[PDB]
Amino acid sequence: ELAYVRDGVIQFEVQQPMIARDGPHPVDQPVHNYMVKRIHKRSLSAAF
Amino acid sequence: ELAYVRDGVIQFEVQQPMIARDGPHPVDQPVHNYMVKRIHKRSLSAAF
Amino acid sequence: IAGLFNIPAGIIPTGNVLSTIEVCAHRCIFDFFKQIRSDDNSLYSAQFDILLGTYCNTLNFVRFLELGLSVACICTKFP
Amino acid sequence: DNSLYSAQFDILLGTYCNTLNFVRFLELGLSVACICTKFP
Amino acid sequence: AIASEALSLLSNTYVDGTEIDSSLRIRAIQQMARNLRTVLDSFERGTA
Amino acid sequence: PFEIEVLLPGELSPAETSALQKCEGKIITFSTLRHRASLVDIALSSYYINGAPPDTLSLLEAYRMRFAAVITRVIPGKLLAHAIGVGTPTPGLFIQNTSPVDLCNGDYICLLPPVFGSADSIRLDSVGLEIVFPLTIPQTLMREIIAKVVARAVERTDVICYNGRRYELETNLQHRDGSDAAIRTLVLNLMFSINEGCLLLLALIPTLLVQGAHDGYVNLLIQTANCVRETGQLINIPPMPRIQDGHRRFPIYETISSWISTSSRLGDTLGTRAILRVCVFDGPSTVHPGDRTAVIQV
Amino acid sequence: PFEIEVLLPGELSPAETSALQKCEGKIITFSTLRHRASLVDIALSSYYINGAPPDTLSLLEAYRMRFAAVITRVIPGKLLAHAIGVGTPTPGLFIQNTSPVDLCNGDYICLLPPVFGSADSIRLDSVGLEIVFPLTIPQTLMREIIAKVVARAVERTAAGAQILPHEVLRGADVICYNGRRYELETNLQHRDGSDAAIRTLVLNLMFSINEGCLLLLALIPTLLVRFPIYETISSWISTSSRLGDTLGTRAILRVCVFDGPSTVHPGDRTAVIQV
Amino acid sequence: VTTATLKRQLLQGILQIDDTAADVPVTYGEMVLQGTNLVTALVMGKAV
Amino acid sequence: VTTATLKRQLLQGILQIDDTAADVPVTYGEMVLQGTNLVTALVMGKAV
Numbered sequence: 001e002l003a004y005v006r007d008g009v010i011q012f013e014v015q016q017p018m019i020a021r022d023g024p025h026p027v028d029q030p031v032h033n034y035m036v037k038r039i040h041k042r043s044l045s046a047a048f
Numbered sequence: 049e050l051a052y053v054r055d056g057v058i059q060f061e062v063q064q065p066m067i068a069r070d071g072p073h074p075v076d077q078p079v080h081n082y083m084v085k086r087i088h089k090r091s092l093s094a095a096f
Numbered sequence: 097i098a099g100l101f102n103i104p105a106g107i108i109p110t111g112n113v114l115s116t117i118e119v120c121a122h123r124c125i126f127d128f129f130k131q132i133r134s135d136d137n138s139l140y141s142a143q144f145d146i147l148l149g150t151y152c153n154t155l156n157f158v159r160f161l162e163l164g165l166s167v168a169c170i171c172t173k174f175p
Numbered sequence: 176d177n178s179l180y181s182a183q184f185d186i187l188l189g190t191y192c193n194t195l196n197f198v199r200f201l202e203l204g205l206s207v208a209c210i211c212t213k214f215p
Numbered sequence: 216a217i218a219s220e221a222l223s224l225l226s227n228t229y230v231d232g233t234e235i236d237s238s239l240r241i242r243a244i245q246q247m248a249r250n251l252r253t254v255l256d257s258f259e260r261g262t263a
Numbered sequence: 264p265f266e267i268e269v270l271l272p273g274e275l276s277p278a279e280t281s282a283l284q285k286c287e288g289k290i291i292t293f294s295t296l297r298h299r300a301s302l303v304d305i306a307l308s309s310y311y312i313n314g315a316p317p318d319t320l321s322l323l324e325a326y327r328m329r330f331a332a333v334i335t336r337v338i339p340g341k342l343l344a345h346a347i348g349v350g351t352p353t354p355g356l357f358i359q360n361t362s363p364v365d366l367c368n369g370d371y372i373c374l375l376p377p378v379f380g381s382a383d384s385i386r387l388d389s390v391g392l393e394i395v396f397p398l399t400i401p402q403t404l405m406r407e408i409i410a411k412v413v414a415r416a417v418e419r420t421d422v423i424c425y426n427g428r429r430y431e432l433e434t435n436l437q438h439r440d441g442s443d444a445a446i447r448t449l450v451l452n453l454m455f456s457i458n459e460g461c462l463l464l465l466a467l468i469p470t471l472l473v474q475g476a477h478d479g480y481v482n483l484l485i486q487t488a489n490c491v492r493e494t495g496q497l498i499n500i501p502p503m504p505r506i507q508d509g510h511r512r513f514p515i516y517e518t519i520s521s522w523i524s525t526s527s528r529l530g531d532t533l534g535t536r537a538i539l540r541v542c543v544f545d546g547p548s549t550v551h552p553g554d555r556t557a558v559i560q561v
Numbered sequence: 562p563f564e565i566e567v568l569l570p571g572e573l574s575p576a577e578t579s580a581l582q583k584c585e586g587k588i589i590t591f592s593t594l595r596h597r598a599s600l601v602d603i604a605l606s607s608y609y610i611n612g613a614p615p616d617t618l619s620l621l622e623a624y625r626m627r628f629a630a631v632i633t634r635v636i637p638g639k640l641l642a643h644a645i646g647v648g649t650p651t652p653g654l655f656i657q658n659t660s661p662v663d664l665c666n667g668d669y670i671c672l673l674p675p676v677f678g679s680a681d682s683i684r685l686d687s688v689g690l691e692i693v694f695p696l697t698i699p700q701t702l703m704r705e706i707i708a709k710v711v712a713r714a715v716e717r718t719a720a721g722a723q724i725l726p727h728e729v730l731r732g733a734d735v736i737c738y739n740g741r742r743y744e745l746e747t748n749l750q751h752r753d754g755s756d757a758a759i760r761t762l763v764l765n766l767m768f769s770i771n772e773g774c775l776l777l778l779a780l781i782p783t784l785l786v787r788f789p790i791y792e793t794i795s796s797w798i799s800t801s802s803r804l805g806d807t808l809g810t811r812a813i814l815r816v817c818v819f820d821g822p823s824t825v826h827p828g829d830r831t832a833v834i835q836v
Numbered sequence: 837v838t839t840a841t842l843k844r845q846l847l848q849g850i851l852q853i854d855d856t857a858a859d860v861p862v863t864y865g866e867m868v869l870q871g872t873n874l875v876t877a878l879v880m881g882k883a884v
Numbered sequence: 885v886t887t888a889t890l891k892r893q894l895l896q897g898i899l900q901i902d903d904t905a906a907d908v909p910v911t912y913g914e915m916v917l918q919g920t921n922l923v924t925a926l927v928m929g930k931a932v
Contacts (some may be wrong), residue, residue: 001235001916001917003146003339003340004182004183004184004235005183005184005185005186005931006184006185006277006339007098007100007185008185008186008187008188009098009100009185009186009187009188009212010187010188010189010190010191011101011103011187011190011191012113012126012190012191012192013190013191013192013193014113014115014119014193015193015195016118016119017195020156028209029133029134031131031133031134032131032132032134032135032136032171033111033119033120033129033130033131034103034104034128034129034130035119035126035127035129035130035131035133036098036099036103036126036127036128037126037127038127040273040274041170041273041340042273043340043364044097049868050262052141052142052143052144053144053145053146054143054144054145054881055145056145056146056147056148056252057145057147057148058147058148058150059148059150060150060151060152061150061151061152061153062152062153063153063155063249063253064155065155065253065256065257065260066253066256066257066260067257067258067260067261068258068260068261069261070597071869072595074546074547075545076252076257078250078253082178082179087148092406100185100187100930101185101187101879101880101881101930102878102879102881105179105187105190106189107879109189109190109191109192110189110191111191112192112193112194113191114193115191121848125248142877142878143881144261144877144880144881144882145881145882146869146882146883146884147883147884147927155195156213157256157259158256158259158260159259160259160263163263163842165263173843176218176221177218177336177922180220180239180242180907181256182925182926182929183339183929184925184928184930184931185930185931186925186930186931186932187879187930187932188929219336234918234922235922238926273813276612280590298731312597354648362781364667368593369626369627369628370626402806403803406798406799406802406803406806407799409798409802410794410795410796410799410802411795413794413798414791414792414794414795414798417791417794418791419640425623450781453773453774453776453777454777456770456773456774457773457774457777461770461773461774463715463719464715464770465771465774465775467715467718467719467722467767467771468771468815469722470718470721470722471767480761481764484764484765484768487796487800488768488772488793488796489789489792489793489796490771490772490775490779490793491768491771491772491775491777494775503727509730509731510729510731511731513712513729513731513734515712515714515715515716516708516709519708519711519712519715519766519770520705520708520712522769522770523704523705523707523708523805525646526769526801526802526804526805526808527805527808527809527810528805529798529801529802529805530802530805530806531802533798533802542594542628542646542647544594544595545683548593559646559647872920876928876930877923879900879932880924880928880930880932881930882928882930884927
C-alpha cells in the first residue's frame with residue numbers, strides 16, 4: 001500500500017562533542033541537532 | 049489535561065428523506081451533508 | 097517545511113550513523129535543520145488535537161396505510 | 176460521491192540517532208611527553 | 216446513483232483478500248443499502 | 264472512447280493538489296494529440312509566440328490549431344482527460360460553467376479567451392508555471408463579442424447587454440502581427456460578395472424605404488442599418504444594364520447563393536466554431552455559474 | 562437505447578387513428594428529451610412564437626435548438642419513438658421519404674421546412690391540434706433549393722417595384738436530380754407562400770447583402786477607377802454571422818441500403834444509419 | 837432565566853407551577869486519556 | 885560503475901582483483917502494516 005500514503009517523513013539526530021578550553025575565549029556548550037526529510041514518487045510502465 | 053489541547057473539534061452527519069413524483073420536474077436523489085465545528089477555551093481567576 | 101511528527105520523538109532507534117563530522121556545514125540537504133544550543137525550550141510542549149465524538153440522525157419511514165388519508169380512496173394492485 | 180471516501184494519511188519511517196565515544200589522556204601517546212599527578 | 220469506484224470494487228468477483236479494501240467494500244455496500252432503503256420509501260411517501 | 268493521461272509532476276504541495284482537484288470538468292487544449300503528455304503543454308508558457316505571453320488575437324488562432332480536451336476525475340498522481348475534436352463516443356460527458364453568463368437547454372458552446380476580469384487560474388510556484396482555462400459562452404454572445412473586438416481593432420490601427428445585464432471587455436492588443444491579419448481575412452470576404460447582381464439589389468432601395476413605412480417592422484431593420492438609410496436619399500443609381508445571355512441565365516441566382524457560403528464561413532474564420540451542445544437529462548433547465556451540466560458532442 | 566413514448570389520447574376517432582398508423586417512419590422534433598411526453602409538444606402549437614404561427618425563418622431556428630426523433634411503431638393506445646440524439650444505438654432505423662425528389666445510396670439527409678407546396682400533415686379536429694412533419698432532402702440539393710426560392714421572391718418584388726417589368730427570361734425554373742425534373746411553381750398566380758412564410762426571410766437577406774457590396778464601396782473607393790463608421794461594421798459582422806448560422810447545413814442521417822433497391826421514390830421507406 | 841420581578845409577575849396569574857421539587861444528577865462525568873491514546877498523542881500529535 | 889573499456893584499462897595493471905565470487909542475499913525483505921496500524925490511519929490519518 002504505497003499509493004495511499006502521502007507526505008511520508010524520516011528524521012535523524014546527531015550530537016557533537018565539545019572541548020574544554022579556558023582563557024580569553026567564551027565558554028562552550030553541548031550540541032544537539034534535529035533534522036527531517038521527505039519522500040518522492042516515480043513509476044514504471046510497459047506494454048503488451 | 050485541558051492545558052494541553054490544540055483545537056479540538058466535533059463533527060456530525062445528517063441525511064434528508066426523498067419524495068417521489070412525476071410530471072415536468074427533475075427527479076430527486078438522496079443528499080448527504082456533513083458538518084464540523086471547533087471549541088472555545090476560557091479561563092477563570094481569583095486572588096488571595 | 098514538513099515537521100509533521102514531533103522532532104525529538106524519543107523512541108527505539110533502528111541503528112546509528114557514525115559519520116564522525118560536523119553536520120552544520122551541509123545545510124541545504126535536509127528539509128528542516130533544527131539546532132538547539134543546549135536544552136532549550138520547545139522540547140517538552142505536547143500539543144495535540146482531540147476528537148470528542150460524532151452524531152447522526154435516524155430518518156424514520158412512513159407508510160401510506162397508516163396515514164388517515166387512506167380513508168379517501170380504495171386502493172388496489174393490478175399487475 | 177467523492178466527498179468522504181478519501182483515506183490519505185502521513186506516516187513516519189522510524190527515526191535515527193548516534194552515539195559518541197570518549198577518549199582518555201593516558202591512552203594517547205602524548206602521555207609520554209610529561210609526568211602528570213594530582214594535588215588536591 | 217452509484218459511483219464508478221464503488222462499482223469497480225464490487226465487480227471484482229473474488230480477485231482480492233487483502234485487509235484495506237475489505238473495509239472499502241463494506242462501506243460501499245453500506246452506502247448502497249442506505250440509499251436503497253430511502254429510495255424505496257420515496258414511493259410510499261409520494262403516493263400521498 | 265479516447266482519453267489522454269496527464270502525468271502530474273511529483274513533489275507537489277498539498278495545497279495545489281486540492282486546488283487541482285477543484286478543476287473537475289474544465290477544458291484544456293493540446294498542440295499534438297497523444298495518450299501520454301506532460302504538464303508543459305497545458306501551461307500558458309506553451310502559448311508563447313515569439314518570447315512572450317500571447318495576445319487575445321493570437322489566442323483565437325491557437326484555439327483553432329490546438330486540439331480540445333475535457334478534464335475528468337483526477338487522482339493524486341495522474342490527471343485523466345478525454346478528447347473532443349476527433350470523432351469518438353463519450354458516454355455521460357459534462358462541463359463546468361466558467362462564464363459569468365447563465366446557460367439553458369439547447370445552447371451551442373463556443374471557446375474564447377478570458378476577455379472579462381483577470382482570469383481565475385491555478386498557479387504553481389514550485390513547478391513554476393500556471394494554467395489558464397478557456398471561457399465558454401453560447402453562440403449568440405460569441406458573435407457579439409467578436410464583432411466589437413474586430414471593430415476596436417480597426418479603430419486602433421464597450422458594453423454588452425445580456426439578459427438585461429451589462430458587461431464590459433478589456434481587450435488586449437499589445438501585439439501587431441495578429442491585428443492586421445484579421446483585417447486581411449475580413450476584406451477578403453467583402454470582396455468576394457460582389458457580383459453582377461448587386462446592381463438589382465442596390466436599385467430596390469427606394470421601394471424598400473416605401474415599404475419601410477406602413478409596415479411597422481422594416482423600420483427596425485432600417486434603424487439598425489446605416490448605409491442603406493443614407494444612400495437611400497443621396498444617390499441616383501443609374502437605371503439598368505442588359506444581360507449578356509439572358510435567354511438561358513439567371514444572374515441574381517449566384518449573388519443570392521454566392522453570399523450564403525460566404526456568410527457561413529464568416530462566423531468561423533473570424534473567431535471559433537461551435538464545439539458542443541448542452542442537453543441535460545433529469546436536470547435543471549437553467550444552470551448557474553460554477554455548476555456542471557451534461558453536454559453532447561456536436 | 563433511449564426511446565421516447567408519446568401518449569396517445571383517449572376518445573380518438575377511428576379515421577384519425579388509421580391516418581396516424583400511416584405515418585410510421587416520420588420525423589418528430591422534441592423540445593426537451595424525456596421518456597414520457599404529451600402531444601402538445603408535437604403539435605404545431607408548441608412551435609409558434611409571439612402568438613402568431615411560426616415563420617420559415619423561425620422554423621429554421623426551431624430545428625436547430627430543438628431535438629429530433631423518429632417514430633418506430635404505433636399502437637391502438639400508445640405511440641413510441643426513438644431519438645437521433647446523444648448516443649442511442651437505434652436498431653433497424655428506417656425513415657419515409659417526404660420530399661418530392663428521389664434518394665439514392667450514400668446520400669446524407671438534411672431537414673427543411675416545407676417550401677415548394679402545401680405541407681401535408683395529420684389534423685386532429687377532435688383534440689384540436691395538427692402535427693406537421695419536416696421535409697427530408699439530400700445535402701447537395703439543399704443549398705441550391707434555398708437560393709432558388711429566395712431569388713424567386715425578389716423577382717416578384719422587382720416586377721412590382723419597377724414601373725415596367727423586365728420579363729424577358731429563360732422560361733421556368735426547375736431542379737434536376739437523377740434525371741428527373743421538378744418544374745416548381747409553373748404559374749405566376751396562386752401566390753400561396755410568396756409572402757406568407759418566406760416574407761421575413763427575404764427581408765433579412767435583402768438588407769445584409771445590400772450592406773455587403775455597399776460598405777466596401779463606401780470604405781475603399783479605389784475599387785472602380787457625425788458618422789460612426791465603426792458601429793456599422795460591428796453591426797454588419799454581428800448580423801451576417803448570425804444569419805450564416807441560421808442557413809447552415811448539417812447532415813443528420815445517411816442512407817445506407819443493403820440488399821435493397823438503390824433508388825427510392827417519394828413514399829418509400831429505407832433503412833438509414835445514424836451519422 | 838429572568839429577574840425576580842418578572843418571575844413574580846409570571847408566577848402570580850400567568851403561569852401555573854407544576855412541582856416544588858426535582859431530581860438532579862450529582863455526577864461530573866470524568867474522562868482522561870490513557871492506553872494507546874497517550875502513545876498516539878505523544879508521537880503523532882492527535883487523539884480520539 | 886563504469887564502461888567496459890575503462891574496466892579493462894583498470895583491471896590490466898592498475899587495480900588488483902581480490903575475488904571472483906561473492907555472497908549476496910537472496911530475499912527482498914518486505915513489510916506490511918498490521919494490527920493497530922489499520923485503525924489509526926483511518927480515524928486520524930497518521931501511521932508509524
